[PDB]
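Narrative progress, year one. The postdoctoral researcher (J.K.) led the effort to move from monomer predictions toward full complexes, under supervision of the PI. The following entry was the first complex the group processed end to end, covering 1294 residues in total.
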Amino acid sequence: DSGCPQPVPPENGFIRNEKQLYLVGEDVEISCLTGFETVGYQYFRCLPD
Amino acid sequence: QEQTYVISAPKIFRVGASENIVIQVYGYTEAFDATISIKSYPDKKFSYSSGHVHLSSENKFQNSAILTIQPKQLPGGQNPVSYVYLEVVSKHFSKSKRMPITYDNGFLFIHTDKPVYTPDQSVKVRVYSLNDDLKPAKRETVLTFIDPEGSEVDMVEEIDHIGIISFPDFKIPSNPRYGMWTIKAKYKEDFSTTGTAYFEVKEYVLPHFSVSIEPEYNFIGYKNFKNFEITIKARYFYNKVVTEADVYITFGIREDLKDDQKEMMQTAMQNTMLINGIAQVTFDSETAVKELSYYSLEDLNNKYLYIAVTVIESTGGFSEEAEIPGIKYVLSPYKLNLVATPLFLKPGIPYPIKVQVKDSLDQLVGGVPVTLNAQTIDVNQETSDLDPSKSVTRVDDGVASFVLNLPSGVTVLEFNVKTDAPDLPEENQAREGYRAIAYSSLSQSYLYIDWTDNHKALLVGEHLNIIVTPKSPYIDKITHYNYLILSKGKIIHFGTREKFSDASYQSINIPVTQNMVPSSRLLVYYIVTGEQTAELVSDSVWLNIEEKCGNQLQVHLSPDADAYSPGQTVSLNMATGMDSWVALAAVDSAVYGVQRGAKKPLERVFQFLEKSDLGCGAGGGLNNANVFHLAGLTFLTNANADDSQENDEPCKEILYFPESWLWEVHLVPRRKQLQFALPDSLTTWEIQGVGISNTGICVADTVKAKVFKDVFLEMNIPYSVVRGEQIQLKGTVYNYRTSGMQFCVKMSAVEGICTSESPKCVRQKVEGSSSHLVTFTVLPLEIGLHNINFSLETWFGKEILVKTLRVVPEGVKRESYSGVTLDPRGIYGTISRRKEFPYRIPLDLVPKTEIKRILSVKGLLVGEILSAVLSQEGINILTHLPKGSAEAELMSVVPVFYVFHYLETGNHWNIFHSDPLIEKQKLKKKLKEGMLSIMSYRNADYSYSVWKGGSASTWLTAFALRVLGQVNKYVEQNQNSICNSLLWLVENYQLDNGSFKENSQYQPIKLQGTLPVEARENSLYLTAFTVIGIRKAFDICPLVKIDTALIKADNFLLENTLPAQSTFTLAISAYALSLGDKTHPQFRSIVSALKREALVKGNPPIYRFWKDNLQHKDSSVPNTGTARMVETTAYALLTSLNLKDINYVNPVIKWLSEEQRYGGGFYSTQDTINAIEGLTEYSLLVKQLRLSMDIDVSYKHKGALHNYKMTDKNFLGRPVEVLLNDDLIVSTGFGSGLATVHVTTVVHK
Ligand SMILES: *[C@@H]1O[C@H](CO)[C@@H](O[C@@H]2O[C@H](CO)[C@@H](O)[C@H](O)[C@H]2NC(C)=O)[C@H](O)[C@H]1NC(C)=O
């Protein structure tokens, strides 16, 4: 289906909804480990490529 | 085997279609009746339709039943019905066959008014809406708009009254993503039909003239690799040659028709003159490649040529460019394939063959020689080779034709067709080998038709006449043959054809009725009873029916003119043979010129309508069954044949200045004449309309109308101008007078623009038939849209033209993004039903610019839901195994409590009517009794023991604390006693490295407790269980020191779970931490280990679970190994539910619902309680994620903005531009589920 595979989250971040595959146009909200806060736009979004 | 039947039906039943099903019986004499019926599958309980059909000699024992699967009578729901039973019943037979059904009923032709749009435009769009019958569908329909990133942007839905669905004009969002947008159209509710259309969003400007680049070939071969030749021409959009342009040629290498940017050339970079509309160019590809590149030979050049061309009009300000994105260098220039060729032999009858020679760019080569080698076998491998025939292709179609008068004994033909252009070697002459096979009758019994493979299509309403010849050992039995005529998937005609006394059979003398006008198909058959064995014999053929509409709506400009003046009052007469609706549109031909590589909106409409043909190829087949399958039919017969062997494979054989206006819908009561004034745009307008009637759709002939004037001005204002910059603006005046004369244009502009000209002029004379360049140098002070007229005051008077300048801010356009997930239940924890976004202002705003802002809410769907539930055994778990010693009372009641809470999830009182409702009061009573019992076992010191005089058990006390944590959901236990029990348990047994080591209780009651891996550090188990019990108690007895002991125990449990030990320990520890810090890094690392230990079935996991200790051994009954298995899996389930990882949990729930190891666990209390806890928590989290949220977004100081009714249906409100300069507060009602919303802020620096 050539969607998006799971991205590696940034340091001290994690995926709210870890999956094998994310749909085109689907956005994944990262979140920060117990000691950390998110700064910036915490969503990656699956592009058609 | 004399008494036989055929019922023949479409290969697939379309939902709601009227399907015509036809029955023939053979060798009966007494007039008898049958019923044909459609019934639910597999149960045959529900008749979707039935038809009584009388069969008699009077009918030649033939009839059809018309049967329809009404869409509402299907059960629908989560699972579409895939299959259905067709049934026949008579005095003499009954049989039923499983038909597939499909919901793909009808067509959704999306028409947008234009192929491309700029930002700050709106796309007027409408859909034509038809059944599988060509009647107007009258079905309510939803458009789904999709951006170039694939995000859904809007759903808009309309009720069809007409077959024309005029949707609301979709304003392009206040910041579009560029590129190809998509629209998908679906009927609501009950059909799968999906229309699709596209449009590109770009900052385009209307081209002033077309540039056409015209290579002689889309390939270069041996002949042209030395040198290639390529014409260029250009015309103004009023269809007159561009008199003079400077042409600059920019060749490049290419490798891929799809996309590449291979090295652009820097040699033979020809600059040349276009004259009288044409430039002729040539390219010595050999010289250019050898000079520029390290490539030097066509052998190195299985590749492509790029060319771009740009042309500058030699006396004016309009300049235009175009490209050919690849001319294929290849030693084999052509490719070859068969067309309309059966690959099935009619022996003795002439076998025609047609073969098409095609470009490497998928285009017809035209005239080429071809030779066809042929080899035949008749019988017993008796092999003979035929003389190789030779032919040449048709100069337009590229189709060569052949025919072989094969032997009457021929059984197979294998034949090799090779291109015979002598200038190509055989390795480059496109050549192919093919095999064609006889009908392979069992009883040497065949059916052939005289159809002369007519290359011309049949003409509507003519009497077609096809002669048909059965041949068989038993011809004197056959007496007649049947025929079926197929249009789309549907049997539109049927009949029978008697043997004359001549032993000659009636031909198919039939009118090609108007329902056949899409290319149609014919199948003929008979059953012959043989000596005693019946055989079904059949054949089929393809019939092209020349595409004549039913309406044939003819529409013409009654004041016929070569060209109209701008603003000319015109009378457009539409005439139709009958009352018809019509849709009308006008679009500037220059807009089709805007798209580099244009296409029309309704090209190929008829071949799209023909997609409903279920058959393929020219006809014939390997067998009667294969003939029926390839015709797109299926059949029920006792005559020793069946379709079922053949797969449903996807057979693929080949057989004022507006940009648009007049966008209107009208009734034409057979005729209506509509008069209107054309726009002021001096261009050819492409006028198109579509008639819609009960007869079907008909796209009218496209009307091209030229708007022309002897003199005019046009100005090359770009799509937008940078604010605060002096610009050079270029135009040219065009003279089509016979003679030159003095012209001036006085420009006049709003004070928002200044120019050095400061307009009366020299009033230059343009010479006749010529254009003169005009240029102004202007600076726009102000953003947005600004008016500027031009008056071409020339001969004895004024002239008027008007334009709007578009002004864009300097520097960079910049943007930011921010957003949140709204969470009114705290599914992720922090309840987040409100947020605010300030009116943030960047550090370097371009001082006069304003920040554009666009909000974008997005729904989050539940996904898959699993109906994991308890059986009516919940009633046994209420009445459960006798209360008494061994605390069989505790074993009975604690399940009563957990069942209580499961039922308390609510479904099992509203819906449980399938089973006996658990009486609320009875459940309450039993609950109360268990509460009293559990109290009775409490130790005086608020410890617990099973034996009255037994030791305190920290384990069993934690189990009590868990259960009494559940009970409060309906009947609180007196919290004082709970608090005292907690204080006892922690104060007595909180060790400082591990905790709550168990006291000297005589034994765990093995069915009440469980066996942990006591061989190593059972303190891990005890700590986990005590933690879990404390967790379930704390909310009813929050205590700071209990919190501290929790922290300690969690820390020890983490640090001592870093070695994996045994996976039961890992799962129960992970669950304990899931109750604690859901998000600690090492917690997650433990989770990532557990998820590694999970076994799965299927590559996408259908089931997921964990095993240890060789539990892979079979066990017919629950046991301690299955107890450990179920426990560790249930703890992993509970952990994953704490993670809310439904996509991970679902296959675990499905596994657990199997009850593999039937009865489960040891059937211990522990496994059962953890399993039910997991099932309840799953059904809870499922109903939590159910999305319902009325998210109301508003400004802080200013009013409300929008109120998205976010629902499983309306799950995605459109993006809203945040106009007003204020802080934004987004809010929701308590609602349900999760959603996320984003604002983007767009600004200049
Ligand atoms: C461009 O031409 C139009 C058409 O004449 C001008 O608009 C007219 O302005 C006068 C007043 O100056 C009104 O009385 C007319 O009714 C307007 N015509 C309309 C509304 O169609 C416009 O002002 C001109 N702009 C210039 C010269 O910059």
